[PDB]
Design an enzyme around this catalytic site. Sequence first.
Site, PDB file in Angstrom:
ATOM      1  N   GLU D 103     -25.342  -9.864  -5.886  1.00 12.01           N
ATOM      2  CA  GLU D 103     -25.581  -8.494  -5.442  1.00 12.01           C
ATOM      3  C   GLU D 103     -25.995  -8.450  -3.975  1.00 12.01           C
ATOM      4  O   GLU D 103     -25.517  -7.602  -3.212  1.00 12.01           O
ATOM      5  CB  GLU D 103     -26.663  -7.844  -6.299  1.00 12.01           C
ATOM      6  CG  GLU D 103     -26.413  -7.974  -7.788  1.00 12.01           C
ATOM      7  CD  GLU D 103     -25.310  -7.058  -8.249  1.00 12.01           C
ATOM      8  OE1 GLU D 103     -24.797  -6.287  -7.424  1.00 12.01           O
ATOM      9  OE2 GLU D 103     -24.978  -7.068  -9.454  1.00 12.01           O
ATOM     10  N   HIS D 136     -28.829  -2.949  -6.928  1.00 10.47           N
ATOM     11  CA  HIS D 136     -28.589  -4.004  -7.910  1.00 10.47           C
ATOM     12  C   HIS D 136     -29.453  -5.211  -7.629  1.00 10.47           C
ATOM     13  O   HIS D 136     -29.929  -5.862  -8.568  1.00 10.47           O
ATOM     14  CB  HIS D 136     -27.113  -4.385  -7.910  1.00 10.47           C
ATOM     15  CG  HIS D 136     -26.214  -3.256  -8.293  1.00 10.47           C
ATOM     16  ND1 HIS D 136     -24.839  -3.307  -8.160  1.00 10.47           N
ATOM     17  CD2 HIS D 136     -26.501  -2.038  -8.809  1.00 10.47           C
ATOM     18  CE1 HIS D 136     -24.322  -2.163  -8.560  1.00 10.47           C
ATOM     19  NE2 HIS D 136     -25.309  -1.376  -8.964  1.00 10.47           N
ATOM     20  N   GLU D 198     -15.209  -7.441  -8.541  1.00 14.33           N
ATOM     21  CA  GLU D 198     -15.706  -6.265  -9.254  1.00 14.33           C
ATOM     22  C   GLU D 198     -14.788  -5.882 -10.406  1.00 14.33           C
ATOM     23  O   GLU D 198     -15.266  -5.563 -11.504  1.00 14.33           O
ATOM     24  CB  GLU D 198     -15.884  -5.104  -8.261  1.00 14.33           C
ATOM     25  CG  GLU D 198     -16.998  -5.443  -7.208  1.00 14.33           C
ATOM     26  CD  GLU D 198     -17.158  -4.429  -6.112  1.00 14.33           C
ATOM     27  OE1 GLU D 198     -16.130  -3.853  -5.691  1.00 14.33           O
ATOM     28  OE2 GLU D 198     -18.302  -4.197  -5.644  1.00 14.33           O
TER      29      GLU D 198
HETATM   30 FE   LIG Z   1     -23.384  -4.909  -7.549  1.00 11.67          FE
HETATM   31 FE   LIG Z   2     -20.225  -3.775  -6.544  1.00  9.50          FE
END
Ligand SMILES: [Fe+3]
Ligand SMILES: [Fe+3]
Lengths: 392, 392, 168, 515, 74, 136, 131
Positions: D103, D136, D198
Amino acid sequence: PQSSQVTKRGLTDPERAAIIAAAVPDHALDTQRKYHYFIQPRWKRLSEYEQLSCYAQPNPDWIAGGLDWGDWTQKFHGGRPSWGNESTELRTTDWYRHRDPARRWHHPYVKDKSEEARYTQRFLAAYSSEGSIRTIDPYWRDEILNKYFGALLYSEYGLFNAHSSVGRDCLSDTIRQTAVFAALDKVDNAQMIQMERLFIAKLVPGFDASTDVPKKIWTTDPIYSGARATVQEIWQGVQDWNEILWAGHAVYDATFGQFARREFFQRLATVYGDTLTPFFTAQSQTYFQTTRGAIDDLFVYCLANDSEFGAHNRTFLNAWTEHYLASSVAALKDFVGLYAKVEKVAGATDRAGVSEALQRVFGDWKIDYADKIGFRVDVDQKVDAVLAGYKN
Amino acid sequence: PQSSQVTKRGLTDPERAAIIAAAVPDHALDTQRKYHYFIQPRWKRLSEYEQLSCYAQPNPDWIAGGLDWGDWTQKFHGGRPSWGNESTELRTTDWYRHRDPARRWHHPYVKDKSEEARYTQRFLAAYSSEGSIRTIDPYWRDEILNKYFGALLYSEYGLFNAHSSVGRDCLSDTIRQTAVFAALDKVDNAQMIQMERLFIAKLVPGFDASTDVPKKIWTTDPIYSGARATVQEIWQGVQDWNEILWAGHAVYDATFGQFARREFFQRLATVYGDTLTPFFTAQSQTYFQTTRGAIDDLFVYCLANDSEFGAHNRTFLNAWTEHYLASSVAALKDFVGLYAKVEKVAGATDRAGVSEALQRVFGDWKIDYADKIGFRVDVDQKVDAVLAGYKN
Amino acid sequence: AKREPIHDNSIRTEWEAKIAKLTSVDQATKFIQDFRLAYTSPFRKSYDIDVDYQYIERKIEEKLSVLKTEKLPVADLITKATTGEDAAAVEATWIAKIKAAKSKYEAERIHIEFRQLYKPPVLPVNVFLRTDAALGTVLMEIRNTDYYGTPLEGLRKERGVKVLHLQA
Amino acid sequence: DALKVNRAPVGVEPQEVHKWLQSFNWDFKENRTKYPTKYHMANETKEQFKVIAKEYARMEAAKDERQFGTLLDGLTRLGAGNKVHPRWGETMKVISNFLEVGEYNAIAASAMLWDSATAAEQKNGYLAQVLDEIRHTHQCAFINHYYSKHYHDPAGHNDARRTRAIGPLWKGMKRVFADGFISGDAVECSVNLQLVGEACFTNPLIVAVTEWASANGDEITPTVFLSVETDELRHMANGYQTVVSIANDPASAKFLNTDLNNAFWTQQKYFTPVLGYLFEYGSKFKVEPWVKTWNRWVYEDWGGIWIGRLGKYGVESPASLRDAKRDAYWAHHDLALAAYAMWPLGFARLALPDEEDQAWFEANYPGWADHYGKIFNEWKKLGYEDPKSGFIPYQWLLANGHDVYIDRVSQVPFIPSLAKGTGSLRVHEFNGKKHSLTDDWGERQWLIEPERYECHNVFEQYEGRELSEVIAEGHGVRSDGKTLIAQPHTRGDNLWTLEDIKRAGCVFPDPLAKF
Amino acid sequence: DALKVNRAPVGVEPQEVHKWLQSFNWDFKENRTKYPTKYHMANETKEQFKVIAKEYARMEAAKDERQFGTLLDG
Amino acid sequence: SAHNAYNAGIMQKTGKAFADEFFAEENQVVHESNAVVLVLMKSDEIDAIIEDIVLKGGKAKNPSIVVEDKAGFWWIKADGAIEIDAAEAGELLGKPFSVYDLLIGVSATVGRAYTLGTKFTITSELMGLDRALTDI
Amino acid sequence: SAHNAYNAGIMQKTGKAFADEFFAEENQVVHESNAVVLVLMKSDEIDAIIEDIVLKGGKAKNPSIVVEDKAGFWWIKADGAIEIDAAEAGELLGKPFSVYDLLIGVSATVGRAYTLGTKFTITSELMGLDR
Ligand SMILES: [Fe+3]
Ligand SMILES: [Fe+3]
């Protein structure tokens, strides 16, 4: 080891969760999962606001709308019912009909005011760090704002306390919510005026945020004489809870209060270089419009158009309006003497400026309230009656 | 019956909960429950802000302050490291030292902005219902606010995008948070300016909220020529991420930005009867003061006083300030041509009034930034340089 | 061999004592350019301080950088390399070099050597970073042309490795 | 005028502002990205999800309030933080802290996409994404922060940001979802961070894992991770716009298939064995075979709904896919040998597979019992768990010629003599330095780009040093200063100390000295 | 003046406003309860917990957010 | 519908039978799929939307929809597209519910996601690459 | 301390023994108590305050304090007074924690409650009546 048992949780303890699972049926025993599904929805779908609020008040069938039966279990000495029809002159086929158009139950109401609470304090911390008070007109700050905006807090405080008997006497749940939230917003207005004064005191050496001078002005200056008389009557002179709500919000606060807050203090702040007061009046004016949505629904949608008592109710509303509009006109006639103490600004504090401000207030009031209950009003006549108090 | 297993929860399923309970030891295996207990606390005790943020960036020991070791796993073609010392001229004994005095990690940051987001829409619904736009000066509204406040949004937008390379290149977690939050506040400012203009379009027939005129003014009007030149340089002309942050927030935005937002549009709103704009600038000025606290910690507490490189860094900070203060003085000299188009108000828009506004801006800037890095500045000399652009 | 501890050892201490004796921008510039040619990149002359050279480089950089702000006029910090060269001329010279390179092997060595010679504090950061990006664009483009075209056996030859082991 | 105005209640909705965002950019010569890139095609695209700053904050704050309500009120009152099976509570020390660095690097990668975007709407979208990756990072930290306060073993939950530097699995984490994103072509991040990272790997990594946590008694992780991935919708949407632009220009489309294959291999090389090992060996209750999870999410759904569909427009199935499927089946079992063998270098307490685990492994991966099972059972008989045994398996590997190599590119450990996954050792000398590579794809990367890949490995840093000295120096101990964080069993008794480690006399070799 | 001011960051805490609430009342003949009561004694007392409207809402909204998070999510 | 099951096809097999198909030559390249996947995290609002929207009118419009219980979330797979009207959800919930509010619970997607009005859609279409089939 | 247990005194007895004392003549009038009762609902912040404040410094200062686990809440009883300093709690929690924030978890009281500075106190004292 504590003296009392450490209770095993049925959700997580294996032995108790197994016993519970053996007891729970393997299918639902009814399919109606809508909480208080039988409420008549105001809007295209039943709202959570209605589900949580409506029929919480346990009225019997002899109070219009009630679903219960029989007398109260305990009444006042002499026989006054816990709630009853004697509490107000107005009548209706169902006291439960009222809906706040903002759909406020307790949670969304404190959620929104919490936002304003916290943001206000970040705004102050930054405004003091900015030094923006340096450009406010000092005479406005010291002689008009401190003293007469301060004195206005007592009008807000009195309208707040006018709701105490309403909170006890009114006949349904959504009405009681509307009234109590209106009261909190009024006492909030009073507290925010004092908060602004206390804040300026931290920035301006010699600026005095004591309420001593505001209170002397509210109680004895002719400028607030009519206003204080009206508030005192609305708060402590009557007990008909519909009369209090109508007179307080729909007549007095919608004419005198809107003029003082929006046409005088808010508007003139933006003519005398006051970058602070608009942040505070933004809150009172937002609250005014939210309160008005609910007051309008109670008196226009429900009571002035109730299928059986609409015209009956308009008779009382028209009589109250005639009396309290006279009181409010006299309040404004006193209040416009304050223009004799301010620096002249063409189109703002001269006669044409004040006349157009009164035309806005009385004209908006004619549209928002008077036309909707059948009350005839000559706006120019009301403007001219107030201007008789303006010193040329 | 779905194709895949309905997984039994170990928290609630009697058999899995019992197996887990048998496996869990009957006592804790350590007593240190402070997440990242080894971070050096800036304040009396470690804050949750520090626990959640500090040492998230995985720097090795050859980037000052890093706790890891060895080279990166994959570098750019040619050998540029994932992060490295070549990213900036400034030096420190520890890049992790920075602390935002507002202690913003992601959660408190979006909580506060969400409060402002929702209150803003309530305020606008009430302000339109109030009709308060009726008393704004029409020339201010249409010829100054719509066009030149509109044009200001491009300054905010450019400062926003100056942060893109900062978000990639900067060398620690707390600095990256500071930079990214400052970027969003800048693009928020630009969006809020547009939101005010679109709001006024719904209330004033014929008022055009298109960005066409604002964009033509920003890109071609001499009033914004110096400002746009500076923003273009800070955004796309340099990549030293400390130079971007310093020039952007500590020089350009603290002088030109503060003059335009606070001394021109906010202050003059409150001499031309504008009750709407102060609500919007209230937000941009709160954001400015929050960003300043973080920018101040990074450049004053950490870099200009770093035990080993403080004087080294002030050499660069002094050279940057010399260059970008000249750029900002030129920007302001162009910008005060706008006073030639506004209606004269004694003490605000006349020469004495503009001079006092520049004295606040340059005087405040000298205290807030120049004095703290040893930058010599003659305030009166800067005010006179700008006043050469003021049309008498 | 037995490595000393990671963050505090005799090699780093000994190099810090050398660095401490640097007294001018010319001396420190020559020192850091020789260091980076000797000990950094895959074409380094020596791996003898492999686990310490990155820390030592940072210390040389800090010494050079402080000498710069103490001795040089402000305008030189912005516009000159510490070799004496005009920073903008160095940029134009090395972009032209790599654009004339005839193969990805020539292009890689130009890019790598530009960093060994001009990495800040030698060149000003803003000039360095944009030059490094322009070089990296060219190098990426020439390497990603027919990336899978040469078999591994051919790449091993072109790189010039001595193959010590290939599992069957 | 001064009397007449429309007083209908109105505000301004986010999409009304969003309409004007594209016009916020202006033209000037220097208005272009700062980062090197191969991709120069037109990319003036529209943002699908119309967000502005105020609405961004409202959405994320609404998510946060529900999440922190559940954690700090409800689940704490239940005592849920200590209702987790020990294997899974240990597993979350590494899943949450390792994901945290992914992250964190995604912040920086998203900032490069923000920089290389040329349309104001895409700059707006990438800033929202930049902000989400900060969110995140803090959410992953909060999980370990919550476990530090409420779980029976806070050590390692409470200090991974320094104790991860001791051990070899951390090195490959700094590539998979980290250096691999931020150290390269800035527009290409739309391919490696977004089209691959992702769109392919965050679903098994962040969503699928929540069912395993639930099975093992952990309701903290589902509360947070399921909120984390609600942000991913807008991220994939951002990257898809640039992939379309790449596909539409023949000059930039000619780079796409190579970038895709290198991204896929780089990510799967570490993700496939490490997550498979954490799911299957770091749990008591298994939801399903890891190779099935991988087949569902990676091969069939991402492969078919993203890559196969894009095959209509020239995008090719990754040439490394076959090698990857072999890793999906065996590479995490290979890694388990290394991870159990080098347990003192970690920051988590491990559990050898029990009899029930062993039957499950053999039923679902036939051949497991005769290859891995027999080794784990011999290690147990040799005293794997017992601090007075003087036994640590890494030494046993060396004595039996099962050397451990570190891939110079991916940093993933490789044991050629025991591995059933994809790989074969190649050892090269270049300019006086020896290098071990382990597959065809990484070897190509290293041969073409040697100056991108100079990562020191644990054997080069620790050569000749004794194990307990390395662990002590890196703070691999509990608050008593002597009991190791890492352990070879999950019970509350007989924990190993630095002196127990030292008793085994394990000294790091140079694995390439023999070549 | 127009140039010099204390720019220390300050706000106004709830107890700072609460200190002035008692002065918000004013004397008039009709200022008494409308309800019957036997109790007519002096009762001019101080409120222990010093809350104002903004702070009341902040407290209750913070209680609500955790409650409804637990219920509707976990 | 069956082919959209989480455990469809090769996922039904175990042991050597699974390995034989997993390593079959034809399964070493991806295969185009017309499916979409949508994950919703379990919650008061989402669980109402699953029961009364997705599994009723949703499955009626698209009979290929499969909904599976994955403990903390719902896994939804279908052919072509999945759509949810936020306005229908707000009508069911009796409280404000915009498309922004629906996204607070959309926890994963596999497919192209877009919004048109109050409707959230994930689709197999490659917007900007696939050419429109009608001029209308 | 033992007299402040939830199950102190008559609460130990069951069956007929409980009934005999419950209906004893001397127990048909209330008996003045010097105790206070404080109830805190379980939560992340409250459980830390219980372990690191009430059961260390609080109990060292007031040894009569008893803390019992009542599933969803903590039940505290002590002679004289119970006090919690919000500033100490904020230092422990690492986040802002005003006296207002402490009340959010104060679920029940038996006694007179007041605040002085950052401290919350529940006391046996009858303020305004006692001297
Ligand atoms: Fe993320
Ligand atoms: Fe992301």
